[PDB]
């Protein structure tokens, strides 16, 4: 869960399939969605297959 | 400077394919909202990760594509890129 950020970066889930939408608290992710990370303006995720 | 152009600059500077923009269109014919989708092919040490970014629905494709780009930038900054 929460994680204040300094000058770190995040890893790319190399070779998979990454998706980013605007995040809204009543969004619905698809079945295969695996949330990578989000602030309160966007969200990133990937698919299972 | 527009987010659409910043994403183009970032993409060449890293020797990446130029980003591709598509559009989902919803509604009856007298009110179409557009959702921007931008695809970036992230090449890191000779391997490829595909980045697909959407924005919110806008009434103008141009605003909708801008916001998609802006999402891609958000993600690329968060993984330490420019």
Numbering used by the authors:
A (entry chain D): 306 to 354
B (entry chain A): 83 to 164
Per the authors:
In vascular plants, dsRNA Binding Proteins (dsRBPs), DRB7.2 and DRB4, inhibit Dicer-like-protein 3 (DCL3) to stall endogenous inverted-repeat dsRNA (endo-IR dsRNA) mediated gene silencing. Intriguingly, the crucial step of endo-IR dsRNA precursor sequestration is the high affinity complex formation of interacting domains of DRB7.2 (DRB7.2M) and DRB4 (DRB4D3). Next, we establish that DRB7.2 simultaneously interacts with DRB4 and endo-IR dsRNA precursors, where DRB4 contributes towards enhancement in the affinity of the complex with dsRNA, thereby impairing DCL3 mediated cleavage of endo-IR dsRNA precursors. Structural and biochemical studies presented reveal that DRB7.2 harbors two independent surfaces for simultaneous association with DRB4 and dsRNA.
To determine the interaction interface in the complex, we crystallized DRB7.2M:DRB4D3. The data collection and refinement statistics of the complex at 2.9 Å resolution are given in [Table tbl3]. The cell content analysis showed the presence of two protomers, a heterodimer of the DRB7.2M:DRB4D3, in the asymmetric unit. The complex is primarily stabilized by the β3 of DRB7.2M and β1 of DRB4D3 by burying ∼ 20% (1750 Å^2^) of the total accessible surface area (8500 Å^2^) of DRB4D3, signifying strong interaction between DRB7.2M and DRB4D3 ([Fig fig4]). The crystal structure of DRB7.2M:DRB4D3 reveals that V132, E134, and, F136 of the β3 strands of DRB7.2M, and V323 and C325 of the β1 strand of DRB4D3 stabilize the dimerization interface through hydrogen bonding as well as polar contact formed by T131 (DRB7.2M) with G320 (DRB4D3) ([Fig fig4]). Further analysis reveals that the complex is stabilized by an intermolecular salt bridge formed between H322 (DRB4D3) and E134 (DRB7.2M) and a cation-*π* interaction by R326 (DRB4D3) and F136 (DRB7.2M) ([Fig fig4]). The association is also established by the C-terminus of the α2-helix of DRB7.2M with DRB4D3 through a weak *π* - *π* interactions formed by W156 of DRB7.2 with F342 and F347 of DRB4D3 ([Fig fig4]) and hydrophobic interaction between V161 (DRB7.2M) and I317 (DRB4D3) ([Fig fig4]). The structure of the complex indicates that the DRB7.2 dsRBD primarily utilizes the β-sheet region to form an interaction interface with DRB4D3 in which the y-shaped α-helical face is completely excluded. The location of the dsRNA binding site lies on the opposite side of the DRB7.2M:DRB4D3 interface thus giving accessibility of dsRNA to DRB7.2M independent of DRB7.2M’s interaction with DRB4D3.
